[PDB]
Amino acid sequence: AMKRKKISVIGAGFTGATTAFLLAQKELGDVVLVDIPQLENPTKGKALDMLEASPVLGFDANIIGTSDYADTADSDIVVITAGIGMSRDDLVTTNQKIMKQVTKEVVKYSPNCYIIVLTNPVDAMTYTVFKESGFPKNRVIGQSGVLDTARFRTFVAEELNISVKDVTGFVLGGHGDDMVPLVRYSYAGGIPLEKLIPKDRLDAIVERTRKGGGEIVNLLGNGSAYYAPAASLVEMVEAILKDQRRILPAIAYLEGEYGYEGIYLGVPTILGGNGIEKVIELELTEEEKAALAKSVESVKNVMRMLE
Amino acid sequence: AMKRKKISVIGAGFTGATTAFLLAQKELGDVVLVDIPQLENPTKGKALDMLEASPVLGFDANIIGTSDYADTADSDIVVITAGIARKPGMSRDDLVTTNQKIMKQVTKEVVKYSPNCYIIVLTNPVDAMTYTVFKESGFPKNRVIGQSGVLDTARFRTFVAEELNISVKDVTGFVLGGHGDDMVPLVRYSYAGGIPLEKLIPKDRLDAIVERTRKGGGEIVNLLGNGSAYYAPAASLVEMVEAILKDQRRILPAIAYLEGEYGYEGIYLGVPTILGGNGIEKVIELELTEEEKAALAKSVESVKNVMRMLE
Amino acid sequence: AMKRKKISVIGAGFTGATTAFLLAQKELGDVVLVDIPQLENPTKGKALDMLEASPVLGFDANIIGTSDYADTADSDIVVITAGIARKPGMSRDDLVTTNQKIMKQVTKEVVKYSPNCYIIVLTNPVDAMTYTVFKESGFPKNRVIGQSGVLDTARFRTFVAEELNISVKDVTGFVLGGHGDDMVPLVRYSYAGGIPLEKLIPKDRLDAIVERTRKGGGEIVNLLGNGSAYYAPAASLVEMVEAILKDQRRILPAIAYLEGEYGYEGIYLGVPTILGGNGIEKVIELELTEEEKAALAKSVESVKNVMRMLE
Amino acid sequence: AMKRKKISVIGAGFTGATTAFLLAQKELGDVVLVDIPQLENPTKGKALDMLEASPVLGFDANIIGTSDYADTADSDIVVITAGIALVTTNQKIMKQVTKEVVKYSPNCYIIVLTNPVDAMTYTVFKESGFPKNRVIGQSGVLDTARFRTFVAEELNISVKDVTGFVLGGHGDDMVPLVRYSYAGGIPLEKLIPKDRLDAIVERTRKGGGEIVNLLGNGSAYYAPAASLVEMVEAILKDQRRILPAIAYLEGEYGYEGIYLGVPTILGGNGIEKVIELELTEEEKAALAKSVESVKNVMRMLE
Numbered sequence A: 001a002m003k004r005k006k007i008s009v010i011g012a013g014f015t016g017a018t019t020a021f022l023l024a025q026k027e028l029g030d031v032v033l034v035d036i037p038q039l040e041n042p043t044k045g046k047a048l049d050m051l052e053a054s055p056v057l058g059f060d061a062n063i064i065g066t067s068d069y070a071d072t073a074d075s076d077i078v079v080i081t082a083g084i085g086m087s088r089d090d091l092v093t094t095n096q097k098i099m100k101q102v103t104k105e106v107v108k109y110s111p112n113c114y115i116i117v118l119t120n121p122v123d124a125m126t127y128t129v130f131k132e133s134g135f136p137k138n139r140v141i142g143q144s145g146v147l148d149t150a151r152f153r154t155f156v157a158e159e160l161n162i163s164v165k166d167v168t169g170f171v172l173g174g175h176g177d178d179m180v181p182l183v184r185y186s187y188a189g190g191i192p193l194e195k196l197i198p199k200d201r202l203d204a205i206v207e208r209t210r211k212g213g214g215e216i217v218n219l220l221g222n223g224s225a226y227y228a229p230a231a232s233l234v235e236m237v238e239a240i241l242k243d244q245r246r247i248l249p250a251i252a253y254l255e256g257e258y259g260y261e262g263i264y265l266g267v268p269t270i271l272g273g274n275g276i277e278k279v280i281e282l283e284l285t286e287e288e289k290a291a292l293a294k295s296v297e298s299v300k301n302v303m304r305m306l307e
Numbered sequence B, C: 001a002m003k004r005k006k007i008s009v010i011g012a013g014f015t016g017a018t019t020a021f022l023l024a025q026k027e028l029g030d031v032v033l034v035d036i037p038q039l040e041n042p043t044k045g046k047a048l049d050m051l052e053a054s055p056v057l058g059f060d061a062n063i064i065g066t067s068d069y070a071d072t073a074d075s076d077i078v079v080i081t082a083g084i085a086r087k088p089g090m091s092r093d094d095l096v097t098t099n100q101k102i103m104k105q106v107t108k109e110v111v112k113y114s115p116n117c118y119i120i121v122l123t124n125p126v127d128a129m130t131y132t133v134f135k136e137s138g139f140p141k142n143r144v145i146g147q148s149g150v151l152d153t154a155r156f157r158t159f160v161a162e163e164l165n166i167s168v169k170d171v172t173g174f175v176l177g178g179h180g181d182d183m184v185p186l187v188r189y190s191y192a193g194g195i196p197l198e199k200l201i202p203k204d205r206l207d208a209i210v211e212r213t214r215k216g217g218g219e220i221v222n223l224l225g226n227g228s229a230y231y232a233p234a235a236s237l238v239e240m241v242e243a244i245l246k247d248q249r250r251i252l253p254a255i256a257y258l259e260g261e262y263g264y265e266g267i268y269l270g271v272p273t274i275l276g277g278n279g280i281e282k283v284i285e286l287e288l289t290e291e292e293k294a295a296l297a298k299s300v301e302s303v304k305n306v307m308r309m310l311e
Numbered sequence D: 001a002m003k004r005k006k007i008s009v010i011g012a013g014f015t016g017a018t019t020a021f022l023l024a025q026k027e028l029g030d031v032v033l034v035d036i037p038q039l040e041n042p043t044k045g046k047a048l049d050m051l052e053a054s055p056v057l058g059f060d061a062n063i064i065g066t067s068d069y070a071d072t073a074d075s076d077i078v079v080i081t082a083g084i085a086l087v088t089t090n091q092k093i094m095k096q097v098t099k100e101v102v103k104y105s106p107n108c109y110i111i112v113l114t115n116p117v118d119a120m121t122y123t124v125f126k127e128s129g130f131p132k133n134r135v136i137g138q139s140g141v142l143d144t145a146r147f148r149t150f151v152a153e154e155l156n157i158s159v160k161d162v163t164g165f166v167l168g169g170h171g172d173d174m175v176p177l178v179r180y181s182y183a184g185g186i187p188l189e190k191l192i193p194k195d196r197l198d199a200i201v202e203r204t205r206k207g208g209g210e211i212v213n214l215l216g217n218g219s220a221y222y223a224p225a226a227s228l229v230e231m232v233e234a235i236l237k238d239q240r241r242i243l244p245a246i247a248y249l250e251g252e253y254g255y256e257g258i259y260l261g262v263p264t265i266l267g268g269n270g271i272e273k274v275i276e277l278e279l280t281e282e283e284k285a286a287l288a289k290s291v292e293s294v295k296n297v298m299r300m301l302e
């Protein structure tokens, strides 16, 4: 008997929905879209509106909304986007319990699933999910590398006036100040960008990448990015579901890699049927090594804010 | 030096934004997303967040957010989802009228910078609002269309897919007239891989599917609480956009301007149509049963009702 | 471990190659192109060529070429196209026996290495060649499938599409019976956007179209001069493969072991089918006219008259 | 009135036919299949077989087979695959081909595949009367794609994440830069030692012959048709890709008066510009050994 893949997308907000919707139209499998019971009606409203567009886009996928994790039973992938002028401490603590509470139900109804976390801060929350899940390091990944690279590509595209298919960004660690960009491993059709873009403009593109998610927040006035984040999540689900062995930047457990371990950190990754198949150790220059250390201690910080 | 197509989506709300997103990702061309001046930053927020997903999904489109119609310069297709939704305290006539003025302000600007474009109208009441854009655009009837029956058949097909547990791709569906009580389904022209549905589903459930397809927009309003359908409505718009942009000569129900078709004239109404590169190519004039001919009459008195509400 | 679906395409000729290329392209799995040892070199040269396309079209599928059934191990779907064509000074009986022979020798080696595969058969005469495969496979009826209906309705839809000047998306067809002459197309079950084709095409034009579809294959071999159609055939195979692999529960006309449906038993025939993750989920029994029951018995007559040449 | 993009595939054999299907499949537009009027019927039934697959795959595309060039009227793109499974034999086809092609589609971009392609595209360029951006060759997209394959098998990572770059002719004329190839963006020199990297460069070079040598009585059509289509799509969708492509140099790299595989921007106006990679002392010397052969083939012409 052939069964289509089953993907459960927890949190039915702006990214979780846009994600659920891409997942459906591509026919990567049936999508179960979960939120708290107070938002179950909306979440079934957002499932069904999506599913009523299944005749029109000509895609065969089931899309249901629910407040009940029994609907998540036997998922291949689980993507967690669930999350809430307030302190860093109370954001990390608040989202952390939500990570613990989402996880216990997820792994319970989905024992052999791969989990992809988006939740902010995705460095410490994927940690929380890794921990809480019990799962071996390969089955728990965070998104942040692919969205940063994607921002930098777009900027590098609209600067050279070429295709986004031809620009490859290389981002290490998390977002903004925690970002360790590798421009030397960034190209336009394999041409090092550092020979196409002048430093001042390239330094600008780096900082805008850093300031990329804040920038959308200020544009919207109410909320953060969901389109590009959503597209980031799907592409990593596409990698696992189709064992594509993608080299993409992911948030990943480190067990000695770059001389660090017992943390999550955004690193070069091979993405396939066993989720994270290989963390990749680059040989890094002295500035990169030292800037990575800032970013590692900047993640050990939020992890001191975990309870 | 023959370049990308240009689609401008007026209103950067849930429908305009979702629709713009689908358009770009199918590389149907460059998308200019347009809303009011207060909401320029949020629009640009939506178009920037879209474009930034393009290196991920591997589609090459320009997408911009803007309240300056300069940016819609020489658009091939224009989708109007620019609209008020019901304001608690509003009469039918106030919405109807509030929305018409928006059509006039939006249309004027659309033919100013894109006088040789094709216009697809979602704004409620769509029957009355596509008419507004036709008589203010000064366009030929073929260059201005309303979306309505795609979303109603897409709804109908899902419930029928769900009843018979078969691919939505092999379920079809026919409706003339509008949404709600205006909707004029032909079960006799609805099927499952070419088996008329009446042979497959009992009468209680089949009537039940029709009823669910009148109330279909309401179903989605009641579940969300605030807001309305966007994904199904956006896909629908995208089907009609795709038809015209690729000259597909599809047979879709669209809101088109009758000039004697079914012996009605000077109006827009949901009729079967060829949709292709000349917009609405033909209105298909079916031979209906007296029943159908007369339920369509009720449906057309409805469209007249609203039409008497235009200032 | 999440693993990709594995498909094996027996016979690396025009149809089997093409099928292997389309499958690869859709990322529907890993593809194993399988001919006789004498054509192993050219079969590996196709698989590599196909695989060398994948950086360009942008799919990750693994394609290799073998004579050896060992690289078909634990295959989910096997698509049997392997066969010989008509050789001059050879009768009906000797192509049938020779192909049957091949059907039997391919299948003992397919069901050894892939015991829980679904098998889609193309080899002409398909209805008997499907029947052989089902006897030698010892698999239940739902796992052994033939292609013929989708090819022919595609041919029919293409002729109506030409005839009306509309997209083929909105043309629906339905054909029971084998191929060529022994082919039963229901014009009453054929529509252009849900509208019966009898209301749109006059009877001379609609009968001739029905006649072009009967001769549909021969038309192409007469134009080619040397060999039979491969694009339309391989596409047909892919939709059927895709329906099993994404459990899409399509209503498709497939070749299916009849066990009382349409008043027939103990044969494989073109019939209505729901094609899903469990192969042939169910044959759908239509209400036919006596003209159609006699028209289908004519097909079964030529079909059974072919089955007789077996052993 | 909105109207389809039209693509005439000149050559209705293995590469010509395989290209037109894909093109129709992707809905890049309407497709005229062409060959000699002898082979008018085999063409037409390639055209019909393909158009008969459209209901099943579900793409709206007119695919027609013809030997009358009138039916290739108004083509946006013209794909030249008319050759013989001899630079003088394939030269003399280009000349008769190009004259009718500029005559029905005078506005059209010409992407050529016929071997020896840099010399056959050059021959197309000279008869065409068109600008240097309007006549393109296909080489590096195929060789590079053979490279990314071999580099994909070797590391077992996605093909999508392998990058490649080959400058120069088709065969032992190829000068791919292993230092402008990567896997995940991380240079291959760092991922693969010199004896196995040398082997991938070697296998890339023989690439075409490996395909001939297995097949027995033809050459490559699946990777070649995809390579053409990618280049069609760049022009038809103004994609503005940086693809390896055969391009008429007028100074570039201190070479001119010759077609040769070089980095380019490929998009709406065809080849918009060729890109000048500054090269290691042995890449320049090696590019020259490739050209100096290439030039000879053009002293095989007329």
Ligand SMILES: NC(=O)c1ccc[n+]([C@@H]2O[C@H](COP(=O)([O-])OP(=O)(O)OC[C@H]3O[C@@H](n4cnc5c(N)ncnc54)[C@H](O)[C@@H]3O)[C@@H](O)[C@H]2O)c1
Pocket (backbone or CB within 6 Å): A010, A011, A012, A013, A014, A015, A016, A034, A035, A036, A039, A081, A082, A083, A084, A095, A098, A101, A102, A118, A119, A120, A122, A143, A144, A147, A213, A223, A224, A225, A226, A229
């Ligand atoms: N890495 C990134 O891409 C990135 C960028 C944007 C968003 N984010 C983070 O991703 C998350 C998603 O944000 P969004 O834009 O989708 O916002 P949103 O508020 O619209 O979505 C959040 C949803 O999660 C639900 N939720 C909250 N607690 C839950 C619980 N215990 N169980 C189940 N559902 C619960 C809420 O009810 C809400 O529907 C946030 O934490 C945000 O900070 C980070």
Ligand SMILES: NC(=O)c1ccc[n+]([C@@H]2O[C@H](COP(=O)([O-])OP(=O)(O)OC[C@H]3O[C@@H](n4cnc5c(N)ncnc54)[C@H](O)[C@@H]3O)[C@@H](O)[C@H]2O)c1
Pocket (backbone or CB within 6 Å): B010, B011, B012, B013, B014, B015, B016, B034, B035, B036, B039, B081, B082, B083, B084, B085, B102, B105, B106, B122, B123, B124, B125, B126, B147, B148, B151, B228, B229, B230, B233
């Ligand atoms: N007829 C149908 O088939 C159908 C289906 C669903 C939606 N609709 C209609 O579509 C309309 C809006 O749909 P939505 O769900 O996206 O709503 P929405 O309110 O979220 O989005 C509408 C957007 O239009 C903008 N707008 C208002 N007046 C404008 C003007 N003069 N110029 C430019 N932009 C302007 C608003 O700022 C808002 O952002 C409503 O009238 C709704 O009834 C009808």
Ligand SMILES: NC(=O)c1ccc[n+]([C@@H]2O[C@H](COP(=O)([O-])OP(=O)(O)OC[C@H]3O[C@@H](n4cnc5c(N)ncnc54)[C@H](O)[C@@H]3O)[C@@H](O)[C@H]2O)c1
Pocket (backbone or CB within 6 Å): C010, C011, C012, C013, C014, C015, C016, C034, C035, C036, C039, C081, C082, C083, C084, C085, C102, C105, C106, C121, C122, C123, C124, C126, C147, C148, C151, C227, C228, C229, C230, C233
């Ligand atoms: N059902 C349909 O609609 C339909 C349409 C087209 C073709 N067909 C039939 O399908 C078959 C395929 O024809 P084609 O166009 O590919 O012709 P072809 O001869 O080019 O392809 C068939 C291939 O089968 C191979 N083969 C033979 N014996 C084999 C064996 N024991 N194991 C493995 N491979 C073996 C041959 O070596 C040959 O390469 C024919 O029997 C044809 O009549 C039916």
Ligand SMILES: NC(=O)c1ccc[n+]([C@@H]2O[C@H](COP(=O)([O-])OP(=O)(O)OC[C@H]3O[C@@H](n4cnc5c(N)ncnc54)[C@H](O)[C@@H]3O)[C@@H](O)[C@H]2O)c1
Pocket (backbone or CB within 6 Å): D010, D011, D012, D013, D014, D015, D016, D034, D035, D036, D039, D081, D082, D083, D084, D085, D090, D093, D096, D097, D113, D114, D115, D116, D117, D138, D139, D142, D170, D218, D219, D220, D221, D224
């Ligand atoms: N240079 C490259 O990048 C590359 C890659 C693969 C193939 N090729 C070349 O592609 C070309 C075609 O290859 P193929 O494998 O399709 O061969 P093929 O089997 O298609 O033979 C060439 C086709 O062109 C037709 N043709 C010949 N003269 C013609 C004329 N005067 N007008 C119109 N059509 C004519 C032939 O009848 C035949 O259909 C050959 O030159 C081959 O060497 C080179």
Ligand SMILES: O=C([O-])CC(=O)C(=O)O
Pocket (backbone or CB within 6 Å): A120, A147, A175, A212, A213, A214, A217, A224, A225, A229
């Ligand atoms: O925290 C934010 O500002 C949002 C963010 O990082 C992101 O979008 O990736």
Ligand SMILES: O=C([O-])CC(=O)C(=O)O
Pocket (backbone or CB within 6 Å): B124, B151, B179, B216, B217, B218, B220, B221, B228, B229, B233
């Ligand atoms: O009016 C509304 O609320 C929206 C609507 O018609 C629909 O979705 O069909």
Ligand SMILES: O=C([O-])CC(=O)C(=O)O
Pocket (backbone or CB within 6 Å): C124, C151, C179, C180, C216, C217, C218, C221, C228, C229, C233
């Ligand atoms: O019938 C034939 O001769 C070949 C065939 O199956 C087809 O193409 O339909």
Ligand SMILES: O=C([O-])CC(=O)C(=O)O
Pocket (backbone or CB within 6 Å): D085, D115, D142, D170, D171, D207, D208, D209, D211, D212, D219, D220
């Ligand atoms: O020489 C040939 O026949 C074609 C060729 O270069 C190739 O396939 O790479």
